[PDB]
Amino acid sequence: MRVGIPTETKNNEFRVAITPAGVAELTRRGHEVLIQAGAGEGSAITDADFKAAGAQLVGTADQVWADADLLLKVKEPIAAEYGRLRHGQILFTFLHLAASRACTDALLDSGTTSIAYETVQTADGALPLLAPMSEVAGRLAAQVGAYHLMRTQGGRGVLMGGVPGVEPADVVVIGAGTAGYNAARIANGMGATVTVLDINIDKLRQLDAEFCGRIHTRYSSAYELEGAVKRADLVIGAVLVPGAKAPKLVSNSLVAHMKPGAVLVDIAIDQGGCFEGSRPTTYDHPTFAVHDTLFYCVANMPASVPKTSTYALTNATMPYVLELADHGWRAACRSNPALAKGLSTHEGALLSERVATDLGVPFTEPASVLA
Ligand SMILES: CNc1ncnc2c1ncn2[C@@H]1O[C@H](CO)[C@@H](O)[C@H]1O
């Protein structure tokens, strides 16, 4: 058994799918760990750090993919990587197959076995590998929203927390899930007057207790959302629905009635976004205009703080990585139903019903390959 970790190849993808701690634990259990030279540098992990932990440093991506029985990544394989996919390999990474027929087809045709980080799901319904990325994105949303509120960024020119005697930014967070909770928490810590909207009153009750009412909570009726958004300096869209696409909760018509220079940060942009006018941008020109407002729609936000997010992710993936390495995909999935819910492809079979219907291709019951 060799576990291989290649360098991430997507635009501004600085994260890596393992850290020296994880390398140490794998090598201690008798597994070889092959890591592409430079793979951790985006995350401030040097080749020397990885080697001291037991990793075999490999000069090329091609050798990692060729030699590895278990291949750990952060993002989905891109076109340039399709020719590296292999029948006898297990790939464990964020896949988002519903968003790519091409990626889905590449995995099936290769016959490879793949497990998606984002559909690994515990009995209580939680998504333990997606969770830390939602936490990072939410906290990032507050700090990037604060920055783009500066007049020198085209924003309204409002300081998050005000100063004594002067109004703070009015911040509206749409969605009180993991991402939204974390956005409201940081925005609140910066001094902003934060209102969180959700249709799940239990989540609002949780926010109300945690901050003793300092974070305002409003039931998200259409009337309430319009009114709050109209008054906001900063709107953070954090309604991320697990699976298919995000609802368009904020219309361009509504945007036209917003304060000039208001900033809208969509952290559901990887699901088409929850604003109507949202188009996925990137760090080069992260913002565009919509009716005198500024939209921030950068996809893959956690990639911008890789030192943090590499650890957040791999801390969460570690026990699954160890199970897969120790026991192989089938035994691991048989023993751990949370991991089985991530099973995506195997030997040309597509194993996600939700992915299959969204693409309109056949689905093979996961039970048929596990039992
Ligand atoms: C108005 N429409 C809406 N407004 C506010 N939150 C919503 C919403 N639709 C879904 N959500 C919430 O989004 C959160 C995270 O996806 C969940 O807590 C949902 O309850």
Tokens describing residue 187? 């925005």
Q: How far apart are CA 90 and CA 346, in angstroms?
A: 9
Number of alpha helices (DSSP H) and beta strands (DSSP E) in the chain: 13, 15
User: What is the set of domains in the chain, with CATH numbers?
Assistant: 1-129+306-371 (3.40.50.720), 130-305 (3.40.50.720)
Stated as kind and residue range, the H or E segment containing 189 is helix 178-189
The single-letter code of the amino acid at 101 is R
Closest ligand 1 atom to 180 CA: 15
Q: How far apart are CA 139 and CA 209, in angstroms?
A: 20
Tokens describing residue 73? 């990544």
Which active-site residues does the annotation give?
Answer: 96, 270
Q: At what resolution in Å was this solved?
A: 2.0
Closest listed residue to residue 190, CA positions, set 125, 224, 145, 126:
145
> By the 8 A CB rule, do 264 and 275 touch?
yes
Residue having the nearest C-alpha atom to atom 1 of ligand 1 = 220
Beta bridge partners of 250: 275
Give the CA count within 13 Å in the CB-facing half-sphere of 221.
3
**C-beta neighbour count of 237 within 10 angstroms:** 30
| Ligand 1 pocket, CB under 6 A | 174-177, 197-200, 203, 220, 225, 239-241, 249
CA of residue 178 to ligand 1 center, whole Å: 11
CA of residue 175 to ligand 1 center, whole Å: 5
Pick from 174, 216, 270 the residue to mutate for probing ligand 1's pocket: most ligand atoms within 8 Å of its CB: 174
- Burial of residue 212 (number of CB atoms within 10 Å: 0-12, 13-18, 19+): exposed
- At 115, give phi and psi (nearest 5°): -130, 125
CA of residue 325 to ligand 1 center, whole Å: 37
52-89: string of b/e by CB count within 10 Å (b at 16+)? ebbbbebeebeebbeebbbbbbbbbbbeebeebbbeeb
Residue having the nearest C-alpha atom to atom 14 of ligand 1 = 175
Tokens describing residue 196? 């969180």
Q: How far apart are CA 120 and CA 124, in angstroms?
A: 12
> By the 8 A CB rule, do 306 and 132 touch?
no
CA of residue 239 to ligand 1 center, whole Å: 5
- Give the C-alpha distances (Å, rounded to integers) separating 267 from 33, 68, 118, 138, 154: 34, 34, 16, 7, 20
For 80, residues 6+ apart whose C-beta sits below 8 A from its C-beta are 9
Q: How far apart are CA 370 and CA 194, in angstroms?
A: 47
CA of residue 35 to ligand 1 center, whole Å: 40
Q: How far apart are CA 348 and CA 326, in angstroms?
A: 24
CA of residue 118 to ligand 1 center, whole Å: 19
- At 251, give phi and psi (nearest 5°): -85, 155
